[PDB]
Amino acid sequence: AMSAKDERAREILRGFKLNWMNLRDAETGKILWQGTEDLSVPGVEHEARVPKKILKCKAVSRELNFSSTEQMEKFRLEQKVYFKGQCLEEWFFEFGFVIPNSTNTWQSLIEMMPASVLTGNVIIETKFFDDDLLVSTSRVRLFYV
Ligand SMILES: c1ccc(CNc2ccccn2)cc1
């Protein structure tokens, strides 16, 4: 007993997949982190170990490679950054239209505390949308190594 929008969300998600993601120091271009696991799955608790060095980056370039079986009118993300239950930062990134059964690459440019304190204390709540239709919600805990 599920809505029209509920069914469209169900379809998109099932037909969606995160292939890989990299993180480069915008300044140099040196890849600081490449992820293989799909961190877009809701319900699961993901974790990530990222090099401490990154916290001394003024800006970082984040590339996502994903595959969607379903067509999407405007694919965009909302991300809140939580420290010990307190939201510190919110961000919005748009990819736009997605071709059905396409594999797309998405590069976003992103413009401070001690690593000892942040490590394991930071959660990145990620909402996936088609235009203004919430398809999935993901939560990733970050560690600085
Ligand atoms: C989906 C897409 C992108 C992110 C971004 N989170 C991360 C993950 C690892 C390191 C830094 N940030 C989370 C979920």
Tab-separated table of all heavy atoms in Angstrom, residues 107-128:
chain	number	residue	atom	x	y	z
A	107	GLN	N	32.010	15.380	-10.359
A	107	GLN	CA	33.069	16.081	-9.585
A	107	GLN	C	32.478	17.363	-8.987
A	107	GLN	O	32.008	18.215	-9.766
A	107	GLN	CB	34.275	16.364	-10.484
A	107	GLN	CG	35.431	17.049	-9.770
A	107	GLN	CD	35.221	18.537	-9.624
A	107	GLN	OE1	34.576	19.177	-10.452
A	107	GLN	NE2	35.773	19.102	-8.562
A	108	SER	N	32.476	17.461	-7.655
A	108	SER	CA	32.084	18.667	-6.878
A	108	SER	C	33.318	19.235	-6.169
A	108	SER	O	34.128	18.434	-5.659
A	108	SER	CB	30.984	18.352	-5.893
A	108	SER	OG	29.739	18.202	-6.558
A	109	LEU	N	33.459	20.565	-6.159
A	109	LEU	CA	34.555	21.276	-5.446
A	109	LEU	C	34.029	21.816	-4.113
A	109	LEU	O	33.055	22.600	-4.133
A	109	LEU	CB	35.091	22.413	-6.321
A	109	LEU	CG	36.283	23.169	-5.736
A	109	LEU	CD1	37.540	22.310	-5.760
A	109	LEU	CD2	36.518	24.476	-6.475
A	110	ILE	N	34.666	21.416	-3.008
A	110	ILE	CA	34.297	21.828	-1.622
A	110	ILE	C	35.369	22.782	-1.083
A	110	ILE	O	36.553	22.401	-1.075
A	110	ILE	CB	34.102	20.589	-0.730
A	110	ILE	CG1	32.944	19.730	-1.245
A	110	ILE	CG2	33.913	20.991	0.724
A	110	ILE	CD1	33.220	18.242	-1.230
A	111	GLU	N	34.945	23.976	-0.659
A	111	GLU	CA	35.826	25.097	-0.228
A	111	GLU	C	36.318	24.844	1.202
A	111	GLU	O	35.845	25.560	2.108
A	111	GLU	CB	35.066	26.420	-0.334
A	111	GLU	CG	33.605	26.311	0.073
A	111	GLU	CD	32.915	27.628	0.384
A	111	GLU	OE1	33.256	28.648	-0.255
A	111	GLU	OE2	32.030	27.629	1.264
A	112	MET	N	38.663	25.282	12.405
A	112	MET	CA	38.833	23.808	12.278
A	112	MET	C	39.392	23.246	13.591
A	112	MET	O	40.092	23.991	14.308
A	112	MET	CB	39.775	23.461	11.121
A	112	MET	CG	39.849	21.976	10.823
A	112	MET	SD	38.221	21.233	10.521
A	112	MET	CE	38.044	21.515	8.759
A	113	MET	N	39.092	21.974	13.881
A	113	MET	CA	39.393	21.302	15.177
A	113	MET	C	40.562	20.333	15.014
A	113	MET	O	40.959	20.012	13.897
A	113	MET	CB	38.173	20.519	15.674
A	113	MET	CG	36.944	21.379	15.895
A	113	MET	SD	35.721	20.585	16.972
A	113	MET	CE	36.627	20.534	18.518
A	114	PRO	N	41.143	19.835	16.130
A	114	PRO	CA	42.170	18.795	16.071
A	114	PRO	C	41.588	17.432	15.663
A	114	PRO	O	40.482	17.115	16.067
A	114	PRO	CB	42.742	18.720	17.497
A	114	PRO	CG	42.149	19.914	18.235
A	114	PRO	CD	40.866	20.263	17.508
A	115	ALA	N	42.344	16.672	14.864
A	115	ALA	CA	41.953	15.348	14.323
A	115	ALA	C	41.665	14.381	15.476
A	115	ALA	O	40.718	13.581	15.360
A	115	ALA	CB	43.045	14.814	13.430
A	116	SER	N	42.483	14.445	16.528
A	116	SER	CA	42.343	13.646	17.775
A	116	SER	C	40.897	13.715	18.279
A	116	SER	O	40.393	12.683	18.756
A	116	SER	CB	43.305	14.124	18.830
A	116	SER	OG	43.092	15.497	19.120
A	117	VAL	N	40.263	14.886	18.156
A	117	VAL	CA	38.924	15.192	18.746
A	117	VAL	C	37.822	14.793	17.757
A	117	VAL	O	36.796	14.245	18.203
A	117	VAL	CB	38.808	16.677	19.137
A	117	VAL	CG1	37.498	16.969	19.851
A	117	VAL	CG2	39.987	17.131	19.983
A	118	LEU	N	38.025	15.066	16.468
A	118	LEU	CA	37.011	14.816	15.407
A	118	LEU	C	36.873	13.312	15.165
A	118	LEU	O	35.726	12.837	15.085
A	118	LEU	CB	37.427	15.533	14.120
A	118	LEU	CG	37.376	17.056	14.176
A	118	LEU	CD1	37.833	17.654	12.855
A	118	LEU	CD2	35.978	17.542	14.535
A	119	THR	N	37.998	12.602	15.043
A	119	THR	CA	38.043	11.186	14.595
A	119	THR	C	36.933	10.411	15.310
A	119	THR	O	36.892	10.449	16.555
A	119	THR	CB	39.425	10.559	14.815
A	119	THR	OG1	39.403	9.254	14.237
A	119	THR	CG2	39.816	10.466	16.273
A	120	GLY	N	36.052	9.772	14.537
A	120	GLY	CA	34.973	8.900	15.042
A	120	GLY	C	33.817	9.679	15.648
A	120	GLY	O	32.847	9.029	16.079
A	121	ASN	N	33.900	11.014	15.676
A	121	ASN	CA	32.898	11.897	16.338
A	121	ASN	C	32.068	12.643	15.286
A	121	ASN	O	31.209	13.466	15.682
A	121	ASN	CB	33.555	12.902	17.288
A	121	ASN	CG	33.950	12.303	18.621
A	121	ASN	OD1	33.469	11.240	19.003
A	121	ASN	ND2	34.820	12.990	19.343
A	122	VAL	N	32.304	12.374	13.999
A	122	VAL	CA	31.685	13.142	12.878
A	122	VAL	C	30.854	12.196	12.003
A	122	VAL	O	31.387	11.152	11.577
A	122	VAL	CB	32.751	13.904	12.067
A	122	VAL	CG1	33.790	12.967	11.474
A	122	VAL	CG2	32.127	14.772	10.986
A	123	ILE	N	29.592	12.568	11.762
A	123	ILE	CA	28.586	11.799	10.966
A	123	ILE	C	28.126	12.678	9.796
A	123	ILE	O	27.785	13.853	10.046
A	123	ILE	CB	27.394	11.368	11.850
A	123	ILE	CG1	27.844	10.707	13.157
A	123	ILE	CG2	26.436	10.478	11.074
A	123	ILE	CD1	28.788	9.543	12.966
A	124	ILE	N	28.122	12.133	8.575
A	124	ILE	CA	27.722	12.861	7.331
A	124	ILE	C	26.408	12.274	6.813
A	124	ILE	O	26.457	11.286	6.051
A	124	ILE	CB	28.841	12.805	6.274
A	124	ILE	CG1	30.135	13.426	6.811
A	124	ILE	CG2	28.387	13.442	4.969
A	124	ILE	CD1	30.985	14.120	5.773
A	125	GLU	N	25.285	12.854	7.248
A	125	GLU	CA	23.910	12.496	6.809
A	125	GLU	C	23.739	12.995	5.371
A	125	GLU	O	23.873	14.217	5.150
A	125	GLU	CB	22.886	13.073	7.796
A	125	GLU	CG	21.450	13.105	7.293
A	125	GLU	CD	20.427	13.461	8.361
A	125	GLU	OE1	20.368	12.748	9.388
A	125	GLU	OE2	19.689	14.449	8.168
A	126	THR	N	23.515	12.071	4.430
A	126	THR	CA	23.442	12.343	2.968
A	126	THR	C	22.054	11.964	2.440
A	126	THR	O	21.732	10.767	2.432
A	126	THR	CB	24.538	11.596	2.193
A	126	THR	OG1	25.801	11.866	2.803
A	126	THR	CG2	24.595	11.994	0.735
A	127	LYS	N	21.271	12.959	2.023
A	127	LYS	CA	19.939	12.766	1.388
A	127	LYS	C	20.096	12.805	-0.136
A	127	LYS	O	20.584	13.830	-0.654
A	127	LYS	CB	18.958	13.857	1.824
A	127	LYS	CG	18.579	13.865	3.298
A	127	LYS	CD	17.576	14.950	3.624
A	127	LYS	CE	17.083	14.904	5.054
A	127	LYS	NZ	15.861	15.726	5.231
A	128	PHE	N	19.688	11.734	-0.819
A	128	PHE	CA	19.631	11.647	-2.301
A	128	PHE	C	18.218	12.016	-2.767
A	128	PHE	O	17.242	11.442	-2.246
A	128	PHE	CB	20.052	10.255	-2.779
A	128	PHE	CG	21.445	9.852	-2.363
A	128	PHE	CD1	21.719	9.498	-1.052
A	128	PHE	CD2	22.485	9.830	-3.281
A	128	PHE	CE1	23.000	9.130	-0.670
A	128	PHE	CE2	23.766	9.462	-2.897
A	128	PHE	CZ	24.021	9.113	-1.592
